[PDB]
Design a protein around this nucleic acid. Structure first.
Ligand SMILES: [Mg+2]
Ligand SMILES: [Mg+2]
Ligand SMILES: [Mg+2]
Ligand SMILES: [Mg+2]
Ligand SMILES: [Mg+2]
Ligand SMILES: [Mg+2]
Ligand SMILES: [Mg+2]
Ligand SMILES: [Mg+2]
Lengths: 65, 46, 89, 87
RNA sequence: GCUGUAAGUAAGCUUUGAUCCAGAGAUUUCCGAAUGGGGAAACCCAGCAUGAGUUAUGUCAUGUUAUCGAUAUGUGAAUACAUAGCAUAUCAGAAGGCACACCCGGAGAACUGAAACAUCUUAGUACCCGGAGGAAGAGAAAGAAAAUUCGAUUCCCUUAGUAGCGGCGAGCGAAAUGGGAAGAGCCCAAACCAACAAGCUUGCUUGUUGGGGUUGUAGGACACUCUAUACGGAGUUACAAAGGACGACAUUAGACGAAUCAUCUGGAAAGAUGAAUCAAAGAAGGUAAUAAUCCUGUAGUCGAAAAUGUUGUCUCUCUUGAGUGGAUCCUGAGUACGACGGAGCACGUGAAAUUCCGUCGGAAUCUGGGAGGACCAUCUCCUAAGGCUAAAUACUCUCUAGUGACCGAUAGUGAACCAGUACCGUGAGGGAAAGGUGAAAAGCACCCCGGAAGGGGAGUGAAAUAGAACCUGAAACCGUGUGCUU
RNA sequence: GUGAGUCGCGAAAGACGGGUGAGAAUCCCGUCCACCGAUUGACUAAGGUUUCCAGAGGAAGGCUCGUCCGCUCUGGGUUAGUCGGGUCCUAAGCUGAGGCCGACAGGCGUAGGCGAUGGAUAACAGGUUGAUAUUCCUGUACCACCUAUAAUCGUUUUAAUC
RNA sequence: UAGAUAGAAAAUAGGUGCCCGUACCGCAAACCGACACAGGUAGUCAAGAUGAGAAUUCUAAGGUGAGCGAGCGAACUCUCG
C-alpha cells in the first residue's frame, strides 16, 4: 500500500484518514473490554495513517513549488 | 574610553609591591562638533 | 478530535454502580479541558447534558524486574447523562 | 543461506549422516536438522523434539559428496565444485 | 525470515523481495538563550488576524506578537527652526551552547625555594573574564650585521646553561652567524585631475566619489618618449576585486574472493598417525578439544542511483607596461622625542639602549629622519607615526583503519554487569560494592516426606560434590569420629 | 571469631472463652477489667508522597512468635460555576526598558511587573461506599453572562442611558 | 465630570460557567530527628460533678491496652511509703 495513495485526489486522502481513525478508535475502545483477540492489526492501521499524511504533506510541498 | 588603564605595580622607596592604575585623564564637555556629551581627554583638547 | 481526546474506557464495580444513574468513566489523553470532552463526546454519540466532572492521579511505583520505575500519569473523566444512554459492550 | 535442502553433518555427535533443514536462525548461527533429539520435558517424561547445531555442515548434489558451496556467477546463483545446480 | 534488550503467549507480515544496511526528504509534543506576559525548568495567563462548533456566549485549530541595533518611513517641539522622543516596517544580524584540550587579550595571587625573610623566586603559573579560529599569533625591514654582506615571518637543531641580569645569594637566561622544514608578497594615506556640494568674495577651498599613485642603490607627482588596448595578455575566487558553468579522484551501503580425505582416542576433533592441495590469500577470530584447505574472513580485483569533499579546463571575471628628466610639490602631527612614575625586552634603575602605558611639554620635511647597547663625530645600513596575508607549527570532545616485551576484575576509565547509579548532604559537591553454569537450556518429567522451603530417589548431560547464592574452591573459622594421651 | 548465647529486647494492666490454622501468651470475634479525657479525642494547614481499601502470601523487615501490618503480589480508589488558590489588589522584598556607574563580569535604580501570612469575593442540611464528600443525589438557594420577550428613551443633544 | 452613543429592560423563560488541589497520618509508627526512637511539631472545637478557674481527682464522647513474656520474690543500684 504505497501507490494506492498516489491514485487519489488530494481530497479523498482526508476521508480515508478519518474513517481509518474511527476504525481504530473502535478497536482501541473495545480493547480494554477484552472483546479483541487480534493484536497486530492495529499497527497496520496506524501505519496507514502515517502513509496518508506523509503523502498529503509531500504533495502539499510540490503544490507549493 | 573610561577604563582604569595601565594597572601595574607601585614600588616604594624600598621596593615593596602595590598595584595602581594611572587612571587616564577624562573630563566631560558639551562636544563642540556634536551637540551631546561624553568623557573626553585633555590631550585631545589642545 | 475525538480520537486523541478519548484514550480508553474504564470498567469496574465503581462504574457498575455508576451506570445506575447513567454515569460512565473514561480515561482521556492529558492536557484536555473539561469542555472539549463535552462537545466532542457530544460530537461522536449525540449524548449530552449532565455536565462532566473530572480528576487527575499522580503516578505510582512498580517493580516488575527488580528495577525501579513509575506508572504513567492518568487523567480520569466521569461522564453522566440525561438523554438516552450509550452501550458499546 | 539454506532452506531445507540436503547436507552431510560431518563434525558433530554422529557423522556420516544426512538430512534436511529447518530454521537457520541468522543471529545465533544455528540450524535445525534431523540428527539431534533432546529429551525435553514439561508438565512428559521425555518429548523427543529436534535441536540445533552450529554450521559444521556442507552440501552435496551432483558428486553425492560434501563440497565447499561456492556462490559463483550471476546468470546470483550457486555453482558448486563439480556441478552447478540450484541450492 | 521478522515482530530490539528480554524471555513467553497470541495475533499477524513476508520471492508482489519483508526485517536489515546506506544516502536524501517529511514529521520533529513540552522546558531550556526561551524570545507575547508571568514563572518555584518542563506549569499557568493573555493578546490580535483567520477559521471550526453554538441560536448565542463560553471552548478550540493554525499563524502572529520580546529586547538590542541598523535601515526606511511618518511624527515629533517642552521652543518657531528642529532636534531627545513617539508609532510602523525590513534583516538567515546578535544574544546562548561548548572540547576543563590548543591560541590571543584584560585583570591577576599564596603556600613554597631562599635552609628565616620583606628585594627576588614560585610566575606572569593558577583560577576568573573576554574574543576568534580550526588553527591562532607574528609579519614583508625606520632589521640583523661589520663582509666577497644578506634582504618577510614562524618552528626544529646548534651556538649556550656561553655572554649577561642578580640582597652578585637563591636563582634566571638570551640573541646573532650557521644547518634544516615551508617558501609570497601586496592595497591604502598624501601631493595631481574630473564630477557634484555649502561657503558661490563672481578668489578657490574645503565636503564626497571616481581615477592617480605606493618607496631608500631613494620613490612618486609634474614634463617628455615608446608598449598595450577593451586586450597581447597577465587572469588566480586562500591576501592582492568580487560573482558563476563543466570533467577526474576519495568518502558515506556492498560483492566476488584457491585449496582435504581417512584410522585411533573422544561425549565431541580442528590432536597423533598417514598419505594429498592453494598460496598476490600461513593476518585474525569462531567452529563440542589447539584448523592455511568447515564458516566468517584476508591478498587482489570490482562497485555508487543520490549526496558530500577535493582537484582539473573553457566558460568566467578583471587588468596597460616600461624609461628618461627631477625646475616645482608630496612622501602618514599634538605623532616622534624629553622629563616624571611604571611595566616589559634574559636585563631588578643600573652607565641602560631598543619597545609600550598615563600626566605634561613638544621637532624636522631629502642638503631630512632612525638605528648600529649611555652620549658626540665619521662611516655603514634602513625610511615609522595606516592596513592584509596560505604553508611549515601546537592540540584531539569525536570518526574511520590499525598497533602494544599495556591491564585482564582489590589492576585497568570511578564505571567490563542497567554507574556518575543506589547512597550521603539543604547545597555546592563526594561516591560505592557486584563478571564467568554447560558445548547446547537439553534449566531436574515422575514417586516419596513435607504446609511450604529443602531434601532423598528417578532421569537430561561425559561430569549435576557443574543444578542456578551454578568453572576451579585454598586459609581463617566451625564441626562429626577416631589412633595416642590427660 | 573472641567477648556471649552474655548486656539489651526502647516508660504502661491485662485475663478468660470460642474460632482459625500444619503450628498460637502475641491473629479475628465477643464478655469482663484497666487507662487519657485543655485529651493518647475530633478538623484542617505545612510536610511526606499511594503509606489509603479489598483479596491472597509470609523469603527477608517488625528488636520475640506471627495464621497479622504502615512488608511483598495482584487489583482498585481522590469528581467542585459557590471550598483554599489563579483569571482581583498590595506592603516588606525581588526583578527592573530607557538611564547613572564601573577593567571585564557586573553593581545601583525610575517607569512598570511579580510576590500573601493580610484586603474583596456567589451555599446550606441530610443521605451514601470496604475506600471520596459544601465535589456524587435529594431537596432547596445564589453570582456573572448570553440568547429570546415587553409596559420606559426621543437633535443623539440632553435625556432614559455607558 | 472629560468623553462614548440610535435608544434602555423593569420581571419573565432558557441556557452557558475553565485550571490546580482534594485519597491517608497530620502531639504521629507515615513530618525533621539514620531506627516502627520516652524529643520538637503554628492553628480551631474542647462536655459532666468539685472548684474562682482551661488548676486538681474521677468519668462522658470517643480512642488505647503501648510488639517479648513466664518463674522466684537473694545481693547490689534506682524509684516511692
Ligand atoms: Mg543567525
Ligand atoms: Mg622611565
Ligand atoms: Mg606618553
Ligand atoms: Mg578472581
Ligand atoms: Mg485464647
Ligand atoms: Mg499537600
Ligand atoms: Mg514520637
Ligand atoms: Mg471542666
Amino acid at each position: 500500500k504505497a501507490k494506492e495513495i498516489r491514485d487519489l485526489t488530494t481530497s479523498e486522502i482526508e476521508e480515508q484518514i478519518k474513517s481509518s481513525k474511527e476504525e481504530l478508535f473502535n478497536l482501541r475502545f473495545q480493547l480494554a473490554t477484552g472483546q479483541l483477540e487480534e493484536t497486530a492489526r492495529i499497527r497496520t492501521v496506524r501505519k496507514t495513517i502515517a502513509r496518508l499524511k506523509t503523502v498529503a504533506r509531500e504533495r502539499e510541498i510540490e503544490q507549493s513549488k | 574610553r573610561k577604563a582604569s588603564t595601565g594597572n601595574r605595580r607601585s614600588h616604594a622607596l624600598n621596593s615593596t609591591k602595590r598595584r595602581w592604575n594611572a587612571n587616564l585623564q577624562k573630563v566631560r564637555i558639551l562636544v563642540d562638533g556634536k551637540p551631546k556629551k561624553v568623557w573626553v581627554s585633555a590631550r585631545a583638547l589642545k | 478530535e475525538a480520537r486523541d481526546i478519548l484514550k480508553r474506557p474504564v470498567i469496574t464495580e465503581k462504574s457498575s454502580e455508576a451506570m445506575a444513574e447513567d454515569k460512565y468513566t473514561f480515561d482521556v489523553d492529558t492536557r484536555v479541558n473539561k469542555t472539549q470532552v463535552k462537545m466532542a463526546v457530544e460530537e461522536i454519540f449525540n449524548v449530552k447534558v449532565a455536565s462532566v466532572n473530572i480528576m487527575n492521579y499522580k503516578p505510582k511505583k512498580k517493580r516488575m524486574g527488580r528495577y525501579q520505575g513509575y506508572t504513567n500519569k492518568r487523567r480520569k473523566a466521569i461522564v453522566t447523562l440525561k438523554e438516552g444512554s450509550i452501550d458499546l459492550f | 543461506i539454506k532452506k531445507g535442502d540436503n547436507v552431510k553433518v560431518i563434525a558433530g555427535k554422529d557423522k556420516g549422516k544426512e538430512g534436511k533443514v529447518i530454521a537457520t536462525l541468522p543471529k545465533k548461527d544455528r540450524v535445525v536438522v534431523e540428527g539431534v533429539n533432546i529429551m525435553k520435558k514439561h508438565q512428559g517424561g521425555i518429548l523427543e523434539t529436534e535441536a540445533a547445531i552450529h554450521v559444521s555442515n556442507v552440501q552435496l548434489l551432483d558428486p553425492k559428496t560434501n563440497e565447499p558451496t561456492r556462490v559463483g556467477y550471476k546468470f546470483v546463483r550457486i555453482a558448486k565444485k563439480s556441478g552447478e545446480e540450484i541450492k
